[PDB]
Coordinates of N, CA and C (backbone and C1' of nucleotides) in Angstrom, one line a residue:
Chain A
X1 N 1.0 -1.3 0.2 CA -0.1 -0.2 0.1 C 0.8 1.2 -0.1
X2 N 2.1 1.1 0.9 CA 3.3 2.5 0.8 C 3.7 2.0 -0.3
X3 N 4.3 1.6 -1.0 CA 5.1 1.6 -2.5 C 4.3 2.1 -3.4
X4 N 2.8 2.1 -3.5 CA 2.5 2.0 -4.8 C 1.9 3.6 -4.7
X5 N 1.7 4.3 -3.3 CA 1.6 5.9 -3.4 C 3.3 6.3 -3.3
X6 N 4.2 6.1 -3.0 CA 5.4 6.2 -3.0 C 5.7 6.4 -4.4
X7 N 5.4 5.5 -5.3 CA 5.4 5.3 -6.9 C 4.6 6.3 -7.1
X8 N 3.8 6.4 -7.0 CA 2.8 7.7 -7.7 C 3.1 9.2 -7.1
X9 N 3.4 8.7 -6.1 CA 4.4 10.4 -5.8 C 5.7 10.8 -6.9
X10 N 6.7 9.3 -6.9 CA 7.5 9.8 -7.5 C 7.3 10.1 -9.2
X11 N 6.1 9.3 -9.4 CA 5.4 9.7 -11.0 C 5.5 10.6 -11.3
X12 N 4.8 11.4 -10.4 CA 4.1 13.2 -10.1 C 4.8 13.8 -9.8
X13 N 5.8 13.5 -9.1 CA 7.2 14.2 -8.8 C 6.4 15.4 -8.0
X14 N 5.5 14.9 -6.6 CA 5.2 15.9 -5.7 C 5.4 16.5 -4.5
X15 N 5.8 17.5 -4.2 CA 6.9 18.2 -3.5 C 6.5 17.4 -2.3
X16 N 7.7 17.7 -1.4 CA 7.6 17.3 0.3 C 6.4 17.4 0.6
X17 N 6.2 19.1 1.2 CA 5.2 19.5 1.7 C 3.4 18.9 1.0
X18 N 3.4 19.1 -0.5 CA 2.5 18.3 -1.1 C 2.4 16.7 -0.3
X19 N 3.4 16.1 -0.3 CA 3.5 14.5 0.3 C 3.1 14.4 2.0
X20 N 3.8 15.6 2.5 CA 3.2 15.7 3.5 C 1.4 15.7 4.2
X21 N 1.1 16.8 2.9 CA -0.3 16.7 3.4 C -0.9 15.4 2.6
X22 N -0.3 14.6 1.5 CA -1.3 13.8 1.3 C -1.3 12.3 2.4
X23 N -0.2 12.5 2.9 CA -0.2 11.7 4.0 C -0.9 11.9 5.2
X24 N -1.1 13.1 5.1 CA -1.6 13.8 6.5 C -3.3 13.1 6.2
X25 N -4.2 13.8 5.0 CA -5.2 13.4 5.0 C -5.5 11.6 4.6
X26 N -4.4 11.3 4.1 CA -4.4 9.4 4.2 C -5.0 9.0 5.3
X27 N -4.0 9.3 6.4 CA -4.4 8.5 7.9 C -4.5 9.7 8.7
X28 N -5.9 10.1 9.0 CA -6.3 10.6 10.3 C -8.3 10.6 10.1
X29 N -8.7 10.6 10.9 CA -9.7 10.5 11.1 C -10.4 12.0 10.7
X30 N -11.6 11.9 10.4 CA -12.4 13.3 9.5 C -12.6 14.5 10.5
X31 N -12.2 15.8 10.0 CA -11.8 16.7 10.8 C -13.2 17.3 12.4
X32 N -14.3 17.2 11.5 CA -15.4 17.4 11.8 C -17.0 16.1 11.7
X33 N -17.3 16.1 12.6 CA -18.4 14.9 12.1 C -19.7 15.9 11.6
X34 N -20.7 15.3 10.6 CA -21.2 16.3 10.0 C -22.7 16.2 11.0
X35 N -23.1 17.4 10.9 CA -24.5 17.6 11.5 C -25.5 17.9 11.0
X36 N -26.5 17.5 11.6 CA -27.6 17.6 10.8 C -28.4 19.0 10.4
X37 N -27.7 19.7 10.6 CA -28.4 21.3 10.4 C -29.8 21.4 10.3
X38 N -30.1 22.0 9.3 CA -31.6 22.9 9.6 C -32.6 22.6 8.3
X39 N -31.8 22.2 7.2 CA -31.8 22.3 5.7 C -31.8 20.9 5.2
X40 N -30.6 19.9 5.6 CA -29.7 18.9 5.0 C -30.1 17.6 5.4
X41 N -30.5 16.7 5.0 CA -30.5 15.7 5.1 C -28.9 14.6 5.4
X42 N -28.6 14.5 6.2 CA -26.8 14.1 6.3 C -26.9 12.7 6.3
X43 N -25.8 12.2 6.5 CA -25.7 10.7 7.1 C -24.2 10.0 6.4
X44 N -23.9 8.9 6.1 CA -23.1 7.9 5.8 C -23.4 7.1 4.7
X45 N -22.8 6.8 4.0 CA -22.5 5.6 2.8 C -21.5 4.9 2.8
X46 N -22.0 3.2 2.7 CA -20.8 2.8 2.9 C -20.4 2.5 1.3
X47 N -19.0 2.6 1.3 CA -18.1 2.8 0.3 C -16.8 2.0 0.0
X48 N -17.0 0.8 -1.1 CA -16.3 -0.7 -1.1 C -14.7 0.1 -2.1
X49 N -14.6 1.5 -2.4 CA -13.4 2.0 -3.3 C -12.3 2.1 -1.5
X50 N -12.8 2.5 -1.1 CA -11.8 2.9 0.3 C -12.5 1.8 1.4
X51 N -13.8 1.5 1.3 CA -13.8 0.4 2.1 C -14.5 0.8 3.4
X52 N -15.3 2.1 3.2 CA -15.3 2.5 5.1 C -16.5 3.7 4.6
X53 N -17.1 3.7 5.9 CA -17.8 5.0 5.8 C -17.5 6.8 5.3
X54 N -18.4 6.7 4.1 CA -17.7 8.6 4.2 C -19.1 9.1 4.6
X55 N -18.5 10.0 5.3 CA -19.9 11.0 5.6 C -20.6 12.2 5.0
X56 N -21.5 12.0 4.4 CA -22.0 13.4 3.6 C -23.3 14.2 4.1
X57 N -23.0 15.8 4.0 CA -23.9 16.6 4.4 C -25.4 16.9 3.9
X58 N -25.0 16.6 2.0 CA -26.6 16.5 2.1 C -26.7 15.4 0.9
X59 N -27.7 14.7 0.9 CA -27.8 13.2 0.1 C -28.2 13.6 -1.3
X60 N -28.6 14.9 -1.6 CA -28.8 15.4 -3.2 C -27.4 16.7 -4.0
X61 N -26.5 16.4 -3.1 CA -25.4 17.7 -3.7 C -23.8 17.0 -3.9
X62 N -23.9 16.7 -2.5 CA -22.4 15.8 -1.7 C -22.4 14.5 -2.5
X63 N -23.8 14.1 -2.3 CA -23.9 12.2 -2.0 C -24.0 12.6 -3.6
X64 N -23.9 12.7 -4.6 CA -24.4 12.0 -6.3 C -22.5 12.3 -6.3
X65 N -21.7 13.7 -6.0 CA -20.5 13.6 -6.4 C -20.1 11.9 -5.4
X66 N -20.2 11.4 -4.4 CA -19.9 10.6 -3.7 C -20.0 9.0 -4.5
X67 N -21.0 9.4 -5.0 CA -21.5 8.1 -6.1 C -20.9 7.8 -7.1
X68 N -20.7 8.9 -7.5 CA -19.4 8.9 -9.1 C -18.7 8.8 -8.7
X69 N -18.1 9.7 -7.4 CA -16.5 9.2 -7.1 C -15.8 7.7 -6.5
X70 N -17.1 7.1 -6.5 CA -17.4 5.4 -6.1 C -17.4 4.4 -7.1
Chain B
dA1 P -16.1 25.8 7.3 O5' -16.9 25.1 7.0 C5' -17.5 24.3 7.4 C4' -18.5 23.3 7.1 C3' -19.5 24.1 6.2 O3' -19.3 23.6 4.5 C1' -21.0 23.4 8.2
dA2 P -20.6 24.0 3.7 O5' -21.7 22.9 3.9 C5' -22.7 23.6 3.2 C4' -23.8 22.3 4.0 C3' -25.3 23.0 3.6 O3' -26.0 22.6 2.8 C1' -25.4 22.6 5.6
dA3 P -25.5 22.9 1.1 O5' -27.1 23.1 0.5 C5' -27.6 21.9 0.0 C4' -28.5 20.9 0.6 C3' -29.3 19.9 0.1 O3' -29.7 19.4 0.8 C1' -30.6 22.1 0.8
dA4 P -31.1 18.1 0.8 O5' -32.2 19.1 0.8 C5' -33.4 18.6 1.5 C4' -34.7 18.4 0.3 C3' -34.5 17.9 -1.0 O3' -35.7 17.6 -1.5 C1' -34.7 20.3 -1.3
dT5 P -36.2 16.1 -1.2 O5' -37.7 15.9 -0.6 C5' -38.0 16.7 0.7 C4' -39.7 16.5 0.6 C3' -40.0 16.7 1.9 O3' -41.5 16.9 2.5 C1' -40.0 14.4 1.9
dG6 P -41.6 18.4 1.8 O5' -42.8 18.1 2.8 C5' -44.4 17.5 1.3 C4' -44.2 16.1 1.5 C3' -45.2 15.3 0.6 O3' -44.8 14.4 0.1 C1' -45.7 15.1 3.2
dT7 P -45.9 13.2 -0.5 O5' -47.0 12.2 0.8 C5' -47.7 11.4 0.4 C4' -47.7 10.5 1.7 C3' -49.3 9.9 1.6 O3' -49.5 8.6 2.4 C1' -49.3 11.2 3.2
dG8 P -49.2 7.3 1.2 O5' -50.9 6.9 2.1 C5' -51.0 6.5 3.3 C4' -52.5 7.4 3.7 C3' -53.3 6.5 2.6 O3' -54.5 5.9 3.0 C1' -53.9 8.9 3.2
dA9 P -54.7 4.5 3.2 O5' -55.0 4.4 4.8 C5' -55.0 5.5 6.0 C4' -56.2 5.3 6.9 C3' -57.2 5.0 6.6 O3' -58.6 4.9 7.9 C1' -57.6 7.3 6.5
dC10 P -59.5 4.0 7.9 O5' -60.5 5.5 8.1 C5' -60.0 6.4 9.3 C4' -60.6 7.5 9.3 C3' -62.1 7.3 9.4 O3' -62.6 8.3 10.2 C1' -61.9 8.7 7.8
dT11 P -64.4 8.4 10.4 O5' -64.8 9.9 9.4 C5' -65.8 10.5 9.4 C4' -65.9 11.9 8.9 C3' -66.7 12.6 8.8 O3' -66.8 13.8 9.1 C1' -65.3 12.5 6.6
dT12 P -68.2 14.7 9.3 O5' -68.1 16.1 8.0 C5' -67.3 16.5 7.3 C4' -67.5 17.2 6.4 C3' -68.6 17.6 6.3 O3' -68.8 19.0 5.4 C1' -68.3 15.8 4.6
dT13 P -70.0 19.6 5.7 O5' -71.0 20.0 4.3 C5' -70.8 19.5 3.8 C4' -70.6 19.9 2.5 C3' -71.4 20.4 1.3 O3' -70.2 21.5 0.5 C1' -70.1 18.3 0.5
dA14 P -70.7 22.4 -1.0 O5' -71.8 21.3 -2.4 C5' -70.7 20.8 -3.0 C4' -71.3 19.7 -3.8 C3' -72.9 20.2 -3.9 O3' -72.5 20.6 -5.6 C1' -73.0 17.7 -3.7
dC15 P -73.9 21.3 -6.5 O5' -74.3 19.9 -7.2 C5' -73.7 19.7 -7.8 C4' -74.1 18.2 -8.2 C3' -75.5 17.9 -9.0 O3' -75.6 16.9 -9.8 C1' -75.2 16.0 -7.4
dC16 P -77.1 17.2 -11.1 O5' -77.4 15.6 -10.8 C5' -77.2 14.5 -11.6 C4' -77.6 13.6 -10.7 C3' -79.3 13.3 -10.7 O3' -79.3 11.5 -11.6 C1' -79.2 13.0 -8.8
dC17 P -80.7 11.5 -12.3 O5' -81.7 10.3 -11.7 C5' -81.2 9.6 -11.3 C4' -82.1 8.2 -10.2 C3' -83.7 8.5 -10.2 O3' -84.4 7.1 -10.3 C1' -83.1 9.2 -8.4
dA18 P -86.2 7.3 -10.7 O5' -86.3 7.2 -9.2 C5' -86.2 6.0 -8.4 C4' -87.3 7.0 -7.6 C3' -89.0 7.0 -8.0 O3' -89.2 6.3 -7.1 C1' -87.8 8.9 -6.0
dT19 P -91.3 6.1 -7.3 O5' -91.9 6.5 -6.6 C5' -91.6 7.4 -4.9 C4' -92.2 8.0 -4.1 C3' -93.8 8.4 -4.1 O3' -94.7 8.5 -3.7 C1' -92.1 10.2 -4.1
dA20 P -95.8 9.0 -3.7 O5' -96.3 9.6 -2.2 C5' -95.9 9.4 -1.2 C4' -95.7 10.8 0.1 C3' -97.0 11.4 0.0 O3' -97.0 11.9 1.5 C1' -95.5 12.5 -1.0
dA21 P -98.9 13.0 2.0 O5' -99.1 14.2 1.4 C5' -97.8 15.2 1.9 C4' -98.1 16.3 1.4 C3' -99.4 17.0 1.2 O3' -99.9 18.4 2.1 C1' -98.0 17.1 -1.1
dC22 P -101.5 18.6 1.9 O5' -101.9 19.1 0.5 C5' -102.4 20.1 0.2 C4' -100.9 21.2 -0.7 C3' -101.4 22.1 -1.1 O3' -100.3 23.5 -0.6 C1' -100.0 20.6 -2.7
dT23 P -101.2 24.6 -0.9 O5' -100.5 25.8 -2.0 C5' -100.9 26.6 -2.9 C4' -99.8 26.6 -4.2 C3' -100.2 27.5 -5.4 O3' -99.1 27.9 -5.8 C1' -99.5 25.2 -5.9
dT24 P -99.5 29.7 -7.3 O5' -99.0 28.8 -8.4 C5' -98.2 27.9 -8.8 C4' -98.5 27.9 -10.1 C3' -98.9 28.4 -11.1 O3' -99.0 28.4 -12.0 C1' -100.2 25.9 -10.9
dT25 P -98.8 30.2 -13.2 O5' -99.0 29.8 -14.5 C5' -100.1 29.4 -14.9 C4' -100.5 28.1 -15.6 C3' -102.4 28.2 -16.5 O3' -101.7 28.9 -18.1 C1' -101.5 26.3 -15.0
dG26 P -102.9 28.9 -18.8 O5' -103.2 27.6 -19.3 C5' -102.3 26.9 -20.3 C4' -103.3 26.1 -20.6 C3' -103.7 25.7 -21.5 O3' -103.8 24.8 -22.7 C1' -105.0 24.7 -19.6
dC27 P -105.4 25.1 -24.0 O5' -106.0 24.5 -23.3 C5' -106.7 23.0 -22.6 C4' -108.0 22.3 -22.5 C3' -109.3 23.2 -23.7 O3' -110.1 22.3 -24.0 C1' -109.7 23.3 -21.3
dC28 P -111.2 22.4 -25.5 O5' -112.3 22.0 -24.2 C5' -112.4 20.8 -23.4 C4' -113.4 21.4 -22.4 C3' -115.1 21.4 -23.3 O3' -115.6 20.8 -22.7 C1' -114.3 22.9 -21.3
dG29 P -117.1 20.9 -23.7 O5' -118.3 21.4 -22.3 C5' -118.1 20.3 -21.1 C4' -119.0 20.9 -19.8 C3' -120.1 21.3 -20.1 O3' -121.4 21.1 -19.0 C1' -118.9 22.8 -19.4
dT30 P -122.4 22.0 -19.2 O5' -123.1 23.2 -18.2 C5' -122.2 23.4 -17.4 C4' -122.5 24.7 -16.4 C3' -123.9 25.2 -17.3 O3' -124.4 25.7 -15.9 C1' -122.1 26.8 -17.3
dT31 P -126.0 26.3 -16.3 O5' -125.7 28.1 -15.7 C5' -125.6 28.3 -14.5 C4' -124.9 29.9 -14.7 C3' -126.1 30.4 -15.7 O3' -126.1 32.2 -14.5 C1' -124.0 31.0 -16.9
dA32 P -127.2 32.6 -14.4 O5' -127.1 34.1 -14.8 C5' -126.0 34.8 -14.1 C4' -125.6 36.2 -14.7 C3' -126.2 36.9 -15.3 O3' -126.4 38.7 -14.9 C1' -125.0 36.2 -17.0
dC33 P -127.0 39.6 -15.3 O5' -126.7 40.2 -17.0 C5' -125.3 40.5 -16.8 C4' -124.8 40.7 -18.6 C3' -126.2 41.7 -19.2 O3' -125.3 42.9 -20.0 C1' -125.8 39.9 -20.4
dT34 P -126.0 43.8 -20.5 O5' -125.9 43.8 -21.9 C5' -124.9 44.1 -22.4 C4' -124.8 43.2 -24.1 C3' -125.5 44.0 -25.3 O3' -125.3 44.3 -26.3 C1' -126.3 41.8 -24.6

DNA sequence: AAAATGTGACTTTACCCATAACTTTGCCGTTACT
């Protein structure tokens, strides 16, 4: 898993700080839990690409993009 | 930091079909008058 990411970085020549951000994003829990708010149907979706639960604030705005990406 | 779910089961009008209990008419018989 780490070797393929390292080859990805080498192929795209991402800088040291860019690699640092990518590594931090890869290994970190989400910053904030999605809140219900007042007008958005929120929740979580199981993704087999990542293989985890991904949180969407809006089921008709962010969730379609999540479906595409999955 | 934020889009984007009202339903549907149980009531209430609303119009039509049927018939009672009278008014509303024409039509003809009768009669006062000319």
